[PDB]
Structures are given as structure tokens and as C-alpha cells.
Amino acid sequence: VLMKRSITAPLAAHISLVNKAAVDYFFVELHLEAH
Amino acid sequence: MIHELLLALSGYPGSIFTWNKRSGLQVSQDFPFLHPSETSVLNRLCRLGTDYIRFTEFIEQYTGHVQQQQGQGGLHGIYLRAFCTGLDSVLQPYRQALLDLEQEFLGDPHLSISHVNYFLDQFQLLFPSVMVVVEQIKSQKIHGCQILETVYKHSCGGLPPVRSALEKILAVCHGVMYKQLSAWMLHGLLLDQHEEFFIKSLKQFSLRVEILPSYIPVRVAEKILFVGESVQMF
Amino acid sequence: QEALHNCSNEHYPVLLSLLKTSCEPYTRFIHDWVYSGVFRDAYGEFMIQVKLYWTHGYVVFLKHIAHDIYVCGKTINLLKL
């Protein structure tokens, strides 16, 4: 059998960081809320 | 004639004991240098070799014949392969015995055929006994969990070697059920499709008295179903 | 797919040893676009291949992680442009 509990965890820990930092890169730098 | 019998008995039938499939092994016939006194002992020993060749043929036939792709558990199906896995390792002392016979024949070549017969007669009862179990499974198209009860009814008898010999096989075919249950209970993941481990959210999941083992009552089975559905939902 | 289908057979370790190294370069390719921002395709055998920025292709490994990598690389690759 295959499982992903020691494969997908140290990958998703970086996926989520990248996505949230992209949202923050929008807002605190490029000010879409101002537009 | 001596060494030839051992070779035939292991599953290499000679030009003396000619293998057919509608009759097994057969001697070449009356010759003026032989007469029935040795002949009958040889025939009685040849019975066990007939059974052994059939066993190896069946075990070979149902284990290692597909890269695993319906509804089939008797031409295919994990439980059949599990039985075939158990049967050869239970058959290991026979091979060990034949191995012993060659060494004894090497030490002193004048040893009788009755000498072989008395050593092998601890197997003379057990080998017909195990045959009806495999014959039941093949004939009645017994698949899935139903193989367990077929072996289990004859592992409640009154002969110790038959009981232990069947017990090892039942351990193996229990093992496949345990492997499916060990994931489905704590996760919900199942590895089987078109076979049952006696439990097939709140729909596509069915529990049946028919597929469940007779010697495992209904009450524990309902709890198993409850656990799996509960963890599957949240 | 043969691994999750059966593991109660004597041919489990041989096929496991085959897959354990046959999945080795693919793991490296997944480990590239996310940690270094370098998109590395092999022969078309790697699952993901390449103003408004919609110029990357997308045409069994689990698809539930496929799109997450597919978006985790393209933001860094946009910062490269």
C-alpha cells in the first residue's frame, strides 16, 4: 500500500506559506485595497 | 526402481510410474522379474505422490498467474491466493521427509521399500484428510470469506495433526482479512474491490449475515460497522 | 496502482524495490519548482509541463496535490518575470 504522511507534509508546509505570502505581497506592498 | 520412486514422488514422474491426469501415476505393468509383493507397497506409496502433484499444480496455478488486471473470488480473488500461500508451507515436512529418504538410501542401499512405507505412514492419514477441504473450495465455488468456514468446520475435529496443519493455513487467510480491517477501522481505507471482508457514507456500505463468518457472531460485526462509518463521516 | 491494490503476496518486496527507485527522479522534479523556483521538465513524462500570464500547460499520482504545485510554482515564476 502507498500513503502520503511523510511525503505530502513537508511539501504542503511550503505550499501554504507561498500562497499566503503572495496574498501579503499584494496587500502590504502593491495596495489593491487602495485601488 | 528405488531412486525412481523418490523422483516420481517429489513431482518428477518417471518412465516407470507414468503420469496421466485422468489416473495419476501408473506402473509399467507385470514383468517376469517383478511380482505383486513389492508392487502393492509401491502403489500405496504412489497415492501420496498423486495427491502431492495435484497440490503443487493447484498452488502454482492460482498464485502468480496475473499482474492483477470483475466479481470473481474463485478463479481470482485474494482469499484463494492466501489459501495457496498457506498450503505449500504446510506441505514443507513432506519435502523434508523425501530429502531424508535420499540420504538414508545413500548410506546403505539395501534398505527396503517397507522401510520407506513406515516412515511415510505418519502422512498416510493426513494427506487424504486435507484433500476434501480444497476439493470443497474448488467444487462448490467457495469464495471470499466462505473459505474460512470451510476450513474451520474441519479444524474442530479430533485428530491433532490435521488440526495443526489446517491451523497454519487459517492463520494466513485470516491475515488477508486482518490486513484489510487494520486500515478500514482506523481510517476507512479499503484495498479490496469486488471482494468482501464481510463488510462491503450511510450508503454503499452494507453488512450481511451471509458473508460474515458463522463462528464470529453478529454482535461484534455490528460494532465494526459502527466504528468504520463513524470515523468515515468526520 | 499495483501497490495499493495488493500487499499480501510474496511479490510485494520485489515490486516495491522496483517502484522505490523508479519514483526517484519524479520526486526530484516535484522538489524543484517549489523549493528553488526552477521549473524542470524531463521528457514530457513529468506531469506538469510548459502579461495576463497563462502560458503554462497542465495536460497514478494524486491529482489532489497536482494543482497545488501547479499554482505554487507559477507565482515565483511570475516574480522571475
Which cell is C9 given? 503476496
**Overall resolution, Å:** 8.1
For residue B177, the one-letter residue type is M
How near does any CA of chain B get to the CA of C14, in Å? 13
User: Which residue from A9, A20, A14, A13 is spatially nearest to C37, judged by alpha carbons?
Assistant: A14
Question: In 10 A of CB B64, how many CB atoms?
Answer: 13
User: Nearest Cβ partner of C8 from B64, B67, B179?
Assistant: B179
| Cross-chain residue pair A18–C35, CB shorter than 8 Å | no
3-state class of C71 per DSSP?
helix
Instruction: Tell me the HSE value of B50 on the side-chain side, using a 13 A CA sphere.
Output: 20
Tell me which chain A residues have a C-beta less than 8 angstroms from the C-beta of C9.
none
Burial class (CB in 10 A: 0-12, 13-18, 19+), A15: middle
User: Which residue from B210, B195, B175 is spatially nearest to B74, judged by alpha carbons?
Assistant: B195
3-state class of B85 per DSSP?
helix
Whole-angstrom Cα distance, residue B113 to residue B111?
Answer: 7
3-state class of B207 per DSSP?
strand
How near does any CA of chain C get to the CA of B192, in Å? 7
| Cross-chain residue pair A22–C7, CB shorter than 8 Å | no
Residue B226 and residue B220 in contact, taking contact as beta carbons nearer than 8 Å: no
From residue C35, alpha-carbon distances to B68, B97, C28, C39, C73 in Å are 38, 62, 11, 10, 9
- Positive or negative, the CA dihedral B45, B152, B61, B97 is negative
B72: left (phi over 0), alpha (psi -120 to 50) or beta: beta
DSSP state of B20: B
How near does any CA of chain C get to the CA of A2, in Å? 6
Q: Which of C68, C69, C79 best probes binding to A when mutated, by most A CB atoms within 10 angstroms?
A: C68
Please indicate if any CB of chain A lies within 8 Å of the CB of C15: no
Please indicate if any CB of chain B lies within 8 Å of the CB of C31: no
For residue B64, the one-letter residue type is G
Please indicate if any CB of chain A lies within 8 Å of the CB of C2: no
Place of cell 454503499: B204
Residue B193 and residue C6 in contact, taking contact as beta carbons nearer than 8 Å: no
How near does any CA of chain B get to the CA of C26, in Å? 24
- Positive or negative, the CA dihedral B181, B185, B190, B194 is positive
> Which residue in B has a C-alpha nearest to residue C5's C-alpha?
B191
Residues 6+ apart with CB under 8 A from B190: B180, B183, B184, B197
Angle at B203 between CA C5 and CA A5, to 5 degrees: 40
Question: In 10 A of CB A26, how many CB atoms?
Answer: 12
> Which residue in B has a C-alpha nearest to residue C4's C-alpha?
B191
Whole-angstrom Cα distance, residue B222 to residue B218?
Answer: 6
How near does any CA of chain C get to the CA of A31, in Å? 17
For this PDB entry, the determination method is cryo-EM
> Which residue in C has a C-alpha nearest to residue B62's C-alpha?
C9
> Which residue in C has a C-alpha nearest to residue A13's C-alpha?
C34
Whole-angstrom Cα distance, residue B23 to residue B50?
Answer: 9
Residue C69 and residue A15 in contact, taking contact as beta carbons nearer than 8 Å: yes
Tell me which chain A residues have a C-beta less than 8 angstroms from the C-beta of C62.
4
3-state class of B24 per DSSP?
strand
3-state class of B228 per DSSP?
helix
| Cross-chain residue pair C4–A1, CB shorter than 8 Å | yes
> Which residue in A has a C-alpha nearest to residue C9's C-alpha?
A1
Which helix (H) or strand (E) is B102 found in, with range? helix B92-107
